[model samples]
Target: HGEGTFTSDLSKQMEEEAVRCFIECLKGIGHKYPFCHCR
Candidate 1:
């Protein structure tokens, strides 16, 4: 999570929520792109 922007405050929960939202959006869009990945 701290791979970059070391001085920035990061939240794992926020990151997880973002990922979840993204995946949910993809699903809502019918999973148009079959291959995708996020950190």
Candidate 2:
């Protein structure tokens, strides 16, 4: 049970970081593609 909990926590943290990085990448390129309408 303890090992499973640690694995779950680690996966969640990695997912959050991946999402954050993806958004950062989008933001970095958004200005160049203003007409793309990411909204």
Candidate 3:
């Protein structure tokens, strides 16, 4: 993590959670582990 910033800390959490959502795109688009977006 980093030092305290007013509207910066929580953005990391949102971005962290955004990755969770991002994985779904892979799951829906990818063919298991290597390629994605064309399945």
Candidate closest to the true structure, highest TM-score? 1
Q: Give the per-residue lDDT digits (tens) of candidate 2, residues 1-39.
A: 454342324767544333544575577643233333333
Per-candidate clash tally: 0, 0, 0
lDDT of each residue in 1-39, candidate 1, tens digit only? 655532212755434434544776766743333432432
Query: How high a TM-score does candidate 3 get?
Result: 0.27
> In model 1, which regions exceed 4 Å deviation?
1-14, 29-39
> Which residue pairs clash within candidate 3?
none
Candidate 3, poorest ten consecutive residues by summed lDDT? 30-39
RMSD of 2: 9.5
Ranked by lDDT, top first: 3, 1, 2
> lDDT: which candidate is best?
3
Residue 29, model 2: Cα distance from true site in angstroms: 7.9
lDDT of 1 at 22: 70
